[PDB]
Amino acid sequence: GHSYEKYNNWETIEAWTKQVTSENPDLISRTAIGTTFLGNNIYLLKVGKPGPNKPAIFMDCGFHAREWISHAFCQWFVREAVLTYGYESHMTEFLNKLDFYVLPVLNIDGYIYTWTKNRMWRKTRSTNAGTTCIGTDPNRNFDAGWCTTGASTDPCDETYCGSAAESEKETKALADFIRNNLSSIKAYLTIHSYSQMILYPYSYDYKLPENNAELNNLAKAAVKELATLYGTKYTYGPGATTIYPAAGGSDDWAYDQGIKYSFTFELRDKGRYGFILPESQIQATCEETMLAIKYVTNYVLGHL
Numbered sequence: 001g002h003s004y005e006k007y008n009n010w011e012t013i014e015a016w017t018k019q020v021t022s023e024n025p026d027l028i029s030r031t032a033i034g035t036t037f038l039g040n041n042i043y044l045l046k047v048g049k050p051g052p053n054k055p056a057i058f059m060d061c062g063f064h065a066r067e068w069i070s071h072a073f074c075q076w077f078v079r080e081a082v083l084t085y086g087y088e089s090h091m092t093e094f095l096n097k098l099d100f101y102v103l104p105v106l107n108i109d110g111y112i113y114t115w116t117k118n119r120m121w122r123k124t125r126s127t128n129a130g131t132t133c134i135g136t137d138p139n140r141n142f143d144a145g146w147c148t149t150g151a152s153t154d155p156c157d158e159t160y161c162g163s164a165a166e167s168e169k170e171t172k173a174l175a176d177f178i179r180n181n182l183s184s185i186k187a188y189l190t191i192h193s194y195s196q197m198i199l200y201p202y203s204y205d206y207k208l209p210e211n212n213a214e215l216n217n218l219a220k221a222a223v224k225e226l227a228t229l230y231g232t233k234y235t236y237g238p239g240a241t242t243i244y245p246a247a248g249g250s251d252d253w254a255y256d257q258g259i260k261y262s263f264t265f266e267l268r269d270k271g272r273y274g275f276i277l278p279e280s281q282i283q284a285t286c287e288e289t290m291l292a293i294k295y296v297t298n299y300v301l302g303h304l
């Protein structure tokens with residue numbers, strides 16, 4: 001059975017994508033945007049009250065298999081949408097005016113692998129020529145400074161960028177969906193863990209986006225909002241001044257497509273538990289993260 005306060009295996013998440021859709025037909029529709037290396041359907045939930053020509057926000061979770069709190073967060077976001085639509089002013093305004101494309105688990109194959117064999121798996125589960133080493137880092141596989149600094153050319157590395165940009169079925173599917181819906185997607189949010197940061201572009205080169213000042217003040221404000229609940233401390237900034245290079249990211253790629261609000265969220269903790277964040281922190285982590293995501297959503301809605 002599914003629980004929003006526990007980590008759910010893929011079979012349970014997949015069943016939940018179907019059930020949450022059938023239980024909430026006037027707010028949610030489900031599609032499959034492609035299949036993974038292992039043939040699993042990559043489900044996408046479109047959350048919002050259907051209406052003519054609505055702007056959208058795209059959010060994905062589970063790029064990196066071991067970052068289980070990310071997968072939990074996408075599910076919590078849907079939980080919140082369903083639960084509070086009609087019961088709280090902001091969420092119902094959000095669902096009435098915007099559509100949210102929520103991709104709960106991008107790297108399904110890796111996620112399954114973290115449940116069956118290796119809790120610390122990160123990459124996809126595709127095969128690489130000339131080696132028995134498996135997988136490509138999906139967040140080094142986008143066409144954004146592809147395979148430059150911070151992305152490894154070695155297939156045995158955790159940061160391998162793949163044989164080519166969009167070599168992975170999962171990243172090709174995501175990129176295809178975004179390119180096909182570029183005129184409506186106004187923001188791109190990608191959920192990861194750990195380290196408690198809100199990043200924005202650029203991580204493939206030492207350069208700053210043209211709307212750097214705007215993104216910095218929004219990230220700063222979202223960090224402040226997140227902290228109000230439990231005092232959790234996040235850092236933020238463009239990759240260029242905040243982290244070491246990490247070329248081939250989807251945030252940078254989405255931004256270079258023209259999606260001006262493109263953010264990577266790295267959730268709890270700061271390293272005590274790292275990727276193995278206890279289930280007892282799911283609720284609090286998701287609740288505080290909701291405050292930042294809603295802050296960003298509200299901002300986007302006011303900046304259309």
Ligand SMILES: CCCn1cnc(C[C@H](CCCN)C(=O)O)c1
Nearest residue numbers: 139192193194195203246249264
């Ligand atoms: C200990 C935290 C490590 N961690 C895990 N996941 C991430 C997300 C970044 C995003 C980089 C900007 N595209 C990355 O893919 O490197 C960081």
Ligand SMILES: [Zn+2]
Nearest residue numbers: 064067192193
């Ligand atoms: Zn990650």
Ligand SMILES: [Zn+2]
Nearest residue numbers: 080286287290
């Ligand atoms: Zn709540």
